[PDB]
Structure formats: C-alpha cells, structure tokens
C-alpha cells in the first residue's frame, strides 16, 4: 500500500502554550489505531472555503484511519460565535468523549471551554488559537512563521551585496492579528538582504481591492521585481501581469496557500507560497485527542513545519497534505 502521511515534519513549542516558548523541530508520529471507537465532537467556524475543507478532510480521514467516530458541526461563519457556543454545548450534552475546536474568537469560547473541562472532557485547540487555560493541546501554526518563511525564501535569492530588488508587499487588512504577524515575520526575515520592500499596501482580501493595489503599485514603481502578499493578491495579480506584458519580469508570491495559488505555481504563473499543511493540523488534533483519552504520551503544542512550495518541489508533495483533494465534498460523520 501507498505511503502514509506520517511521520511528518513538525515544530513543537516548549513550554507548551507559552507565548515566548521555544520551537524545536520534531517528526510527528500518530498512533496506529485507537483502542476503542472514541466519540469526537469537532466544531468548525464554517465550511465556506478550501482551507476549512482541507481541515475537514484531515479530521475525517484521520478519524477513519484510527477507527474513531467524528461528529462535525460548523457554525456558518465568523459572525456566528453564539452558534458555535450552542453547537459545542449541544454536542457535549448529547454525549461525547473529546471536543476539537476551530475557534471563531480567541476568548469567546473560554467560558464554555471551562465548563466542558469541569466534566473531564479534553478540549483541543485546532488552527486558530484559543486563550483558555483549559485547553489540553494545540494543533496550529503561527502567521509570523508563514510571513518569515516567505521572506527568507526571497532573501536567499537576493543576499546582501547583490543588486537591490524591489518587492511590492500586500499583507491584507491593516491591524488584523494574522496580517500584522505575517508582516512582522516577512520584514524581519528580509532584513539585511538586497531586498527593498516598498511601504506596505494594506486592504481587504477582496479580489478587486487587491488588484487595484497591485495596479497602483506597478504604475508607481515600474521596476518592481516581486509582488508578494495575500493569496488573494497573488491570484488576482496573475491577470494584471499578463495584461501588462510583465510575465517573467515580475514574479508573484503569496504568504499562504489556496487552490488558486497552487494551480498558479503548477502553471508557472505564481512563483511560490508557504504551506501550513492545514490538513495535517486536522489529523494531529484527532491523534492528540485519542492519545489524551487513552492516557498516552502526546505532544501538547505543535504545528506542521512550514515550508515554501515552488516549481521545484510542488510535484514531490502529496496535494492532500496541504490542500483538500479537488472535488472533495465536506464530511460531517
Ligand atoms: Cl466567515
């Protein structure tokens, strides 16, 4: 039979949950099987995009592999904190062994998580990050690291002492936590190289908004060498580059992964983007839950090791570790 997803390159944080904990590289090894058909309640913010479809795929496939029963519910959007609270309350009242949560906000579920913990039910923090002290384990990554890996990739191509090259940087909506973290990471990582970054151009992750920013930047700086920023930005920039006759003169990068960015890399139109292996974040959360329920050793705070995908390695990575399969329909049971 064909290779399993594991062992998988990961990075764990010690002390776990510490805001200043140290990262170390480790291979993540899950259990071969669960000892019983544990019931896992899985609460998602929504099922509206490819990203959370990818997390769904990981949770469903890892639950199947281990032999456990997943019951997944989704709240319909990031406006829906109250529905996520009720859906979690309800899955616990109905009876469950552990709860895996992709939280709509960092603090908003803290009250209900505290109440669940009083019932000796493990709660796993999946992807987004929860500030509750009653979390048993985290399966997630940092957007600082996503930005940093994107920046280091470019900085290696353009080391100190080589000719200055200009990057147009389009980080997403100003002041958003994830954006400001990716920004700091990107800027820290390119420091001391021949990269010059233009002042950041923020805006909402709308296609037209980001296209207009890139247009305006190209007008102002005709010699821009790279356009880097959100996946929305990189996807929208492909057409602009084509229309302006800049293909191969300006390269595109995103600081996170989407199907559109993936196809772009495949087709030679987008140069690179990091992958957080969100499918594997889903799988690890399930493995963590099972290990806790069975009293086994587990890694308390861990994420997949972030790596940059480009033409030279995209064919070497199974898509299903970093995106949902094409055509995949969401699974709830
Ligand atoms: Cl949403």
């Amino acid at each position: 039979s064909m290779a399993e997803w594991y062992p998988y390159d990961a990075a764990k944080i010690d002390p776990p949950f510490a805001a200043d904990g140290k990262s170390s590289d480790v291979k993540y090894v899950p259990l071969e099987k669960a000892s019983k058909p544990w019931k896992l309640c899985v609460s998602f913010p929504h099922m509206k995009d490819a990203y959370w479809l990818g997390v769904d795929y990981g949770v469903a496939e890892e639950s199947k592999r281990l032999g456990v029963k997943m019951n997944l519910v989704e709240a319909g959007g990031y406006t829906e904190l109250n529905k996520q609270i009720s859906q979690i309350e309800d899955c616990v009242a109905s009876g469950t062994d552990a709860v895996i949560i992709g939280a709509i906000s960092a603090d908003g579920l803290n009250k209900v998580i505290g109440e669940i913990a009083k019932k000796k039910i493990p709660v796993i923090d999946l992807v987004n990050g929860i500030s509750s002290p009653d979390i048993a384990a985290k399966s997630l990554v940092s957007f600082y690291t996503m930005g940093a890996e994107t920046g280091s990739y470019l900085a290696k191509k353009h080391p100190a002492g080589t000719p200055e090259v200009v990057v147009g940087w389009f980080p997403g909506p100003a002041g958003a936590g994830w954006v400001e973290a990716a920004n700091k990471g990107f800027m820290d990582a390119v420091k001391g190289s021949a990269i010059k970054v233009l002042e950041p151009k923020y805006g909402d992750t709308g296609k037209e908004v980001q296209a207009k920013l890139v247009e305006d930047a190209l007008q102002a700086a005709p010699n821009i060498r790279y356009v880097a920023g959100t996946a929305v930005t990189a996807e929208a920039a492909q057409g602009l580059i084509r229309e302006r006759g800049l293909k191969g003169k300006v390269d595109l990068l995103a600081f996170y992964m989407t199907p559109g960015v993936y196809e772009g890399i495949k087709r030679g139109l987008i140069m690179a983007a990091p992958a957080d292996s969100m499918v594997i974040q889903g799988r690890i959360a399930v493995d963590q839950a099972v290990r806790i329920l069975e009293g086994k050793d587990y890694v308390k705070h861990v994420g997949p090791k972030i790596f940059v995908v480009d033409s030279a390695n995209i064919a070497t990575v199974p898509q299903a570790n970093i995106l949902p399969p094409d055509g995949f329909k969401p699974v709830f049971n």
Side-chain angles (χ1 to χ4, degrees), residues 1-21 23-333:
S1 65
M2 158 210 312
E4 301 275 27
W5 67 266
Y6 58 92
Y8 206 84
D9 287 341
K12 61 182 182 80
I13 302 295
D14 296 277
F17 302 174
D20 68 319
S23 182
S24 58
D25 295 345
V26 289
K27 301 284 193 171
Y28 190 91
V29 184
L31 298 172
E32 283 304 288
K33 273 293 185 176
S35 64
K36 66 164 264 183
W38 302 106
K39 288 190 61 89
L40 305 182
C41 169
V42 187
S43 169
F44 270 24
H46 65 72
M47 191 75 72
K48 290 160 81 192
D49 59 16
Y51 187 94
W52 287 93
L53 191 63
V55 187
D56 178 61
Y57 176 81
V59 177
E61 288 292 307
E62 190 71 351
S63 297
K64 253 195 299 184
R65 192 183 69 73
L66 286 174
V68 295
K69 307 184 227 81
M70 159 192 83
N71 153 49
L72 187 147
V73 296
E74 60 89 15
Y78 276 113
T79 52
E80 303 304 298
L81 174 68
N82 291 332
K83 168 64 82 141
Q84 178 168 49
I85 291 173
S86 52
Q87 286 179 315
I88 291 162
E89 285 176 328
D90 292 349
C91 75
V92 174
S94 285
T96 194
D97 299 320
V99 179
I100 296 168
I101 302 176
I104 280 169
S105 84
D107 308 339
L109 307 178
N110 284 5
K111 178 175 183 319
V112 63
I113 293 178
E115 296 169 345
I116 294 157
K118 291 186 190 195
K119 292 165 152 170
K120 307 173 94 97
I121 295 169
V123 181
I124 311 299
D125 180 2
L126 171 64
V127 177
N128 284 345
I130 294 162
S131 76
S132 173
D134 283 311
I135 287 296
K138 298 175 180 281
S139 183
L140 41 73
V141 309
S142 174
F143 260 104
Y144 178 93
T145 311
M146 301 287 274
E149 286 291 339
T150 303
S152 289
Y153 185 83
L154 288 176
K156 281 164 162 98
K157 297 163 76 74
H158 301 282
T162 70
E164 173 168 357
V165 295
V166 177
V167 176
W169 176 235
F170 303 91
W178 65 282
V179 172
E180 299 294 340
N183 182 65
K184 289 189 181 59
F186 185 78
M187 294 304 288
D188 288 347
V190 299
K191 195 156 15 60
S193 72
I195 294 158
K196 164 63 191 175
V197 189
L198 295 176
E199 297 291 25
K201 291 289 158 177
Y202 300 94
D204 292 327
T205 45
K207 193 203 324 306
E208 293 64 39
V209 168
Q210 293 301 315
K212 172 64 173 162
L213 297 170
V214 173
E215 288 168 46
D216 287 345
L218 293 173
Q219 276 298 142
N223 204 243
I224 284 171
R225 179 63 182 84
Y226 300 100
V227 165
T230 73
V232 175
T233 313
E235 298 177 51
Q238 299 175 106
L240 310 183
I241 292 313
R242 189 185 59 250
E243 289 321 305
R244 285 174 161 265
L246 299 174
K247 187 218 238 197
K249 297 188 189 168
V250 177
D251 283 291
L252 312 175
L253 292 89
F255 63 90
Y256 65 90
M257 182 64 61
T258 64
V261 170
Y262 188 88
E263 174 66 12
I265 295 170
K266 270 182 123 291
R267 286 169 175 181
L269 300 181
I270 295 179
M271 174 174 265
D276 73 342
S277 294
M278 89 290 281
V279 177
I280 306 306
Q281 289 175 53
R283 300 191 178 266
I284 285 170
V286 170
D287 187 57
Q288 279 170 330
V290 172
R291 286 170 171 284
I292 291 162
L293 288 164
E294 296 186 2
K296 289 181 168 60
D297 283 345
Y298 62 105
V299 177
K300 186 160 172 167
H301 183 172
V302 62
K305 180 82 180 170
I306 292 158
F307 58 95
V308 172
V309 177
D310 63 14
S311 294
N313 67 357
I314 188 164
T316 66
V317 178
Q319 180 175 322
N321 292 344
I322 60 170
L323 282 173
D326 301 283
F328 174 71
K329 291 181 171 178
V331 177
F332 298 91
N333 293 277

